[PDB]
């Protein structure tokens, strides 16, 4: 298509919201949108122009292909960090209504690394206190936590332990004594997924992921330690437990190790076969979709839930290891240090929420790949501390740029289904955070700057 | 049976020479001839008759009481009335029965009194609030007293601790603007719907705890440490309630510190 | 027969008890063992708990011998009375002093006093003369207590109500009610966390 | 081991199972629809309790020895 003939299909609603009307791609069902500021518009449009002039579709075209699947309601949404990825675009959001039997699930919508997330721990020390023993603390953290490809968890595990962890989740880690009662409180979904069946997981995944628990892995996973830099919302920071600057925090970014990838692939290979029988055709062969009320769809849902529980157990074990390391270094009990957990969000999970569309209540299964859930204040699924400020959302970046802590808003719940960005993506994290703040879908509360990072 | 009788006497409290097992055994073997035995029987039977609804330790009177108090011992009443039995075992049995019956009557009366006072407290009356204030402010119970006298008493009491503490202690009410009677119905409706929603939320929280403890109960150590788990879990768990206690009185009594 | 003793122990069928029955006697024995005597652990009582088995009397003899009861099942009524007395004695050994001493034997000025007390303690007037009295009760209990006197030595609009009733004065009351409800829910959550910690400390 | 774990958690028991236990122990039941009354009766009459600590009296001393 001609570049002007392509751009005739794009318009703007307001300053921080574009709009892709029907007709951009064949067999659309509803218009797509994305939230970008002036710097982001240039990047998106340069990408589109170069694509119209590689084997990967442009981000807008992937949004369009996503906007064609059956059962999708409201509009396809691209968060300010949207970029091209397998199947669903990275940072793309889509909610399907369970009431319509035509509704489908998508293994690519949830993501290959099922339920990778960020957990934050606060500590009552200061930067000038950690700094004298900064090297010793970094060495102790590096040696205590097994990080790297092929590393095995220090704590032992078996088949029964893995099966129980898959079935329960944070409950198993909290029963063995690895996590306090407060850790279950400050966790998304309260640490575990209700519907889950370990026997719905392929035994190959269980065999592969047995020694991988407690291991950070390679890629974007880390267990870095950082210092508070600025506070934008005094009330929100006080509620979260951070009152004055210079406080110490530790974020652990971790995934589901090998269970998530194996579950995703084993679901995809059967989902492709089931697509032929189910009579479903879409723009891209990578967009796997089968009916929600189907054996393959239910099996994938249960496998993804088990992978999420495994990832939560892994994060809880990492928290316990970090707490032990800090207690050993500072020769004080961790409870005295006040090493609690602020929150735990997951940006690679599809969950069954109850958003409201067009003034009519609907139960929606929502895919969130590369995007973090946020909820407005007084929502009945947030901890009691955050019922007045809104659910925290932690923007886990990498080494270098400073991670952020936003909070959800009332507008975002009714506009973008309570979803915000989850990092810079393959762009500027500050630009994305500013776009989210100006769009009315979040508000920043704390900015944290790293001092030490533990990678592999 | 000497140990049981000695324990009962110690629980009830006796200043006599019965604290020695040998003396008690000798007195019981002696029978009704000992003045100590008849004195003790009279001391027990006066209180037993006082406690029973139908209200000298001669065999006829105590046997009549045994018949009236539904004494279940096989042939004890008839043999006591006849006087043919002189075994010490009969003496131990009758002492044990009368003492246990007296203890049970005392327990029953105490429990009935406690239940009656709890029922009286349950009534939604100003008396409960006045009693709570007087008890927490070391003042005489206003029940049975003139209301103006008690009101003046609590009035005078409050100031003596008011100025002892700094003025910025009670604080100013958070509900500052005046509210007319018209808005109170709407306020009550808002409170009712909020209470219903938060009751639902509390019930969900309690059910989450139920699921977590069920997941706990399947542990291998959970099958060998049942005593400690029960002791440390039953009273903690069975005290939670789903009902929300917020009312308009809490709104009126709320100060500016809760609205910070 | 055994009515007073059973009632003192808070039995569910004080009148309908029969000693000569077969199954109901075992039911009462197990209730007394797990409720009013509590000698062994819960898990050990299993052999005694099994009611319809024909080997139950042997476990009954073992239980009677363990507590060192002077009698045996040859006199069922004797053991019933002895065990009832033992349970009553066990209940008695909690507070001896209080149990030993038991022995059978709209006004305008009221409203004015309540109004004066409310005015002194900064409580807004209300139509019902009992509501503000309860307000004074809560205020005095919360603030005029030994703990508070021992420990003696953000704007309202900054919070989010979550909705809008369209009023300027009812909004403040709605915000206050929401804050009170949130505080109660937080108290419940703290109790739940305490219970979970207490249970997990055993394992 | 299963029976004690079943009797110790009235919260997880079904309504029908609680009613069956209450009828088996010949316990009078009022307003059977309400769960609160059934749970109260079960806690007041059926649930077992831990072993009592040894009393200060002579019987406890004899039992300890």
């Amino acid at each position: 298509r001609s570049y002007n003939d392509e751009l005739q299909y794009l318009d703007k609603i307001h300053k921080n919201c574009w709009r892709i009307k029907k007709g951009f791609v064949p067999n659309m069902l509803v218009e797509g949108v994305f939230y970008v500021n002036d710097p982001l518009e240039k990047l998106m449009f340069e990408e589109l122009r170069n694509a119209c002039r590689g084997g990967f579709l442009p981000a807008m075209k992937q949004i369009g292909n996503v906007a064609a699947l059956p059962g999708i309601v409201h509009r396809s949404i691209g968060l300010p960090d949207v970029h091209s990825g397998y199947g669903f675009a990275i940072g793309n959001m889509a909610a399907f209504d369970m009431e319509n039997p035509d509704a489908v699930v998508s293994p690519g919508g949830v993501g290959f690394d099922i339920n990778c997330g960020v957990r934050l721990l606060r500590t009552n020390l200061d930067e000038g206190d950690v700094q004298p023993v900064k090297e010793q603390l970094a060495q102790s953290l590096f040696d205590h936590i097994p990080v790297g490809v092929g590393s095995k968890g220090v704590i032992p595990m078996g088949a029964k332990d893995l099966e129980e962890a898959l079935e329960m989740g944070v409950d198993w880690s909290l029963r063995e004594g690895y996590a306090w009662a407060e850790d279950k409180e400050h966790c998304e979904e309260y640490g575990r997924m209700l519907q889950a069946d370990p026997n719905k997981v392929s035994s190959k995944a269980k065999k592969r992921g047995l020694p991988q628990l407690g291991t950070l892995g390679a890629g974007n996973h880390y267990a870095e330690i950082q210092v508070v830099d600025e506070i934008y919302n005094d009330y929100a920071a006080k509620k979260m437990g951070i009152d004055h600057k210079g406080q110490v925090c530790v974020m652990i970014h971790s995934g589901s190790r090998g269970l998530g990838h194996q579950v995703a692939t084993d679901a995809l290979v059967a989902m492709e076969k089931a697509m032929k029988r189910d009579r479903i055709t879409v723009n891209d062969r990578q967009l796997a979709c089968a009916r929600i009320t189907s054996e393959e769809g239910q099996d994938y849902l249960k496998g993804m839930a088990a992978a999420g529980n495994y990832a939560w157990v892994n994060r809880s074990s990492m928290t316990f290891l970090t707490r032990q390391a800090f207690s050993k270094v500072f020769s004080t009990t961790p409870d005295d240090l006040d090493m609690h957990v602020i929150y735990d969000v997951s940006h690679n999970i599809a969950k069954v929420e109850e958003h409201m569309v067009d003034g009519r209540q609907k139960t929606l299964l929502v895919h969130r790949k590369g995007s973090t859930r946020a909820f407005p204040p007084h929502h009945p699924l947030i901890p009691v501390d955050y019922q007045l400020t809104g659910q925290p959302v932690l923007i886990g970046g990498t080494m270098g740029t400073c991670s952020y802590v936003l909070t959800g808003t009332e507008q975002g719940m009714t506009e973008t289904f309570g979803t915000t960005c989850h990092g810079a993506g393959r762009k500027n994290v500050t630009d994305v955070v500013n776009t989210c703040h100006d769009a009315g879908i979040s508000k920043k509360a704390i900015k944290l700057r790293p001092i030490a990072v533990i990678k592999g | 049976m000497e140990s049981d009788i000695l324990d009962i006497l110690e629980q009830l409290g006796y200043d006599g020479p019965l604290a020695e097992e040998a003396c008690l055994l000798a007195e019981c073997g002696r029978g009704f001839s000992s003045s100590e035995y008849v004195n003790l029987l009279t001391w027990l039977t006066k209180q037993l008759t006082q406690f029973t609804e139908t209200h000298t330790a001669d065999p006829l009177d105590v046997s009549r009481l045994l018949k009236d108090c539904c004494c279940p011992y096989e042939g004890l009443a008839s043999r006591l009335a006849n006087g043919d039995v002189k075994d010490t075992r009969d003496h131990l049995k009758i002492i044990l029965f009368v003492s246990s019956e007296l203890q049970s009557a005392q327990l029953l009366l105490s429990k009935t009194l406690r239940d009656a006072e709890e029922r009286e407290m349950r009534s939604c009356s100003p008396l409960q609030d006045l009693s709570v204030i007087c008890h927490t402010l070391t003042l005489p119970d206003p029940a049975g007293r003139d209301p103006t006298d008690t009101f003046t008493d609590i009035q005078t009491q409050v100031n003596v601790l008011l100025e002892k503490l700094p003025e910025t202690h009670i604080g100013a009410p958070a509900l500052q603007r005046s509210i007319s009677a018209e808005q109170w119905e709407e306020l009550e409706k808002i409170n009712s719907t909020l209470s219903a929603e938060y009751e639902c939320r509390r019930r969900m929280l309690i059910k989450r705890l139920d699921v977590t403890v069920q997941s706990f109960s399947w542990s291998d150590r959970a099958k060998v440490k049942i005593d400690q788990m029960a002791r440390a879990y039953q009273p903690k768990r069975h005290s939670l309630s789903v009902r929300s206690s917020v009312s308009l009185a809490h709104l009126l009594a709320a100060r500016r510190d809760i609205c910070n | 027969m055994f009515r007073r003793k059973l009632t003192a122990l808070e039995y569910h069928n004080p009148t309908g008890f029969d000693c000569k029955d077969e199954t109901e006697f075992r039911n009462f024995i197990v209730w007394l063992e797990d409720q009013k005597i509590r000698h062994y652990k819960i898990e050990d009582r299993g052999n005694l708990r099994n009611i319809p088995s024909s080997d139950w009397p042997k476990y009954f003899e073992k239980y009677l011998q363990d507590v060192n009861c002077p009698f045996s099942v040859q006199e069922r009524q004797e053991t019933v009375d002895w065990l009832l007395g033992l349970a009553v004695r066990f209940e008695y050994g909690d507070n001896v002093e209080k149990y030993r001493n038991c022995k059978p034997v709209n006004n305008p000025d009221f409203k004015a006093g309540v109004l004066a007390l409310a005015n002194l303690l900064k409580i807004q007037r209300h139509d019902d003369y009992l509501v503000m009295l309860k307000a004074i009760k809560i205020l005095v209990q919360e603030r005029l207590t030994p703990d508070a006197i021992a420990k003696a030595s953000v704007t309202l609009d900054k919070h989010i109500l979550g909705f809008d009733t369209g009023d300027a004065t009812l909004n403040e009351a709605a915000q206050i009610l929401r804050l009170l409800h949130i505080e109660e829910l937080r108290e419940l959550q703290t109790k739940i966390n305490e219970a979970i910690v207490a249970v997990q400390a055993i394992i | 081991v299963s029976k004690v774990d079943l009797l110790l958690h009235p919260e997880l028991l079904s309504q029908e199972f609680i009613q069956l236990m209450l009828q088996e122990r010949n316990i009078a039941v009022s307003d059977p629809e309400d769960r609160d009354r059934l749970t109260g009766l079960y806690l007041q009459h059926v649930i077992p309790l831990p072993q009592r600590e040894l009393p200060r009296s002579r019987w406890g001393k004899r039992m300890e020895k």
């Binding site: 209700l194 209540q361 009945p380 699924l381 | 929603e197 639902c200 059910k207 139920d210 | - | 997880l12 079904s14």
Partner: peptide, 28 residues
Amino acid sequence: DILAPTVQELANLEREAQTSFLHLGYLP
């Protein structure tokens, strides 16, 4: 049955809480 489905009724309670929250302050 000797046991009751607790996870399913927990999910039902969560859904009911979400419905109440939406109906309170998101009703058009």
